[PDB]
């Protein structure tokens, strides 16, 4: 018999993104080639099958630095990290291939699905 | 020119609640009288003006235990912690007064607003 506040989840995600932009309570650095990205482990886990597996591992859960596979493109990762914290995906002709490949590696099934759909249309 | 995934924020909150239920990456214990509640500091900050103030404080940001004011009712807190992680508020005749008082203390303005509306109707 609960009541529900429709905008609550969106408002929570908006505040988590504000914490990220101000580097507040970030507890991990994701290294992608020469580029570094600060984030919250819980948000990464909630969005990605790969980060979920990494941070539930009894040894990796305690690492402050995670290095991604050298094939991963820093721009594709940046677009996906922004999507994790906003629900908004900056999908463009020039980045769609790098975004899909990064989403497959990160195990973000809904992003992989829209990339496959957008590629099929063209 | 971004695209948006409508269910993303709700899915993120659902996964954060799953992490809470399994006690994964919880980094704080909230003590309310004899009762203890494990949670994620970032989620508490995203939902509450009080926790936002506490965990942005250069000294308190590093505490693993937070003790609430002894006037705070453990059941009212539990109902509000559940709302933070689900968007669902278990508001009942027998708990509305304790829920409103706890929401005022935690600075959760939308919960305070619906409690005032529900009290006014009766």
């Amino acid at each position: 018999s609960c009541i529900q506040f429709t905008r609550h989840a969106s408002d929570v995600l908006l505040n988590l993104n504000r914490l990220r932009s101000r580097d507040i309570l970030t507890d991990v650095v994701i290294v992608v080639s020469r580029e570094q990205f600060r984030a919250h482990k819980t948000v990464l886990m909630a969005c990605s099958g790969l980060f979920y597996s990494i941070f539930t591992d009894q040894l990796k859960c305690n690492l402050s630095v995670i290095n991604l596979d050298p094939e991963i493109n820093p721009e594709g990762f940046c677009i996906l990290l922004d999507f994790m914290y906003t629900s908004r995906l900056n999908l463009r002709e020039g980045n769609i291939m790098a975004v899909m490949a990064t989403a497959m590696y990160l195990q973000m099934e809904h992003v992989v699905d829209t990339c496959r759909k957008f590629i099929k249309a063209s | 020119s971004c695209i948006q995934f409508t269910r993303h924020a709700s899915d993120v909150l659902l996964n954060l609640n799953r992490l809470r239920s399994r006690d994964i990456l919880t980094d704080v214990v909230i003590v309310v009288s004899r009762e203890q509640f494990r949670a994620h500091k970032t989620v508490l900050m995203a939902c509450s003006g009080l926790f936002y103030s506490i965990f942005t404080d250069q000294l308190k940001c590093n505490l693993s235990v937070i003790n609430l004011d002894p006037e705070i009712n453990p059941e009212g807190f539990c109902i509000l912690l559940d709302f933070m992680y689900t968007s669902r508020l278990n508001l009942r005749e027998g708990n509305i007064m304790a829920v409103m008082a706890t929401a005022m203390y935690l600075q959760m303005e939308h919960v305070v607003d619906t409690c005032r509306k529900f009290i006014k109707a009766s």
Binding site: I3, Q4, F5, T6 | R88, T114
Partner: peptide, 4 residues
């Protein structure tokens, strides 16, 4: 607020 809604009835979910």
């Amino acid at each position: 607020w809604v009835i979910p």
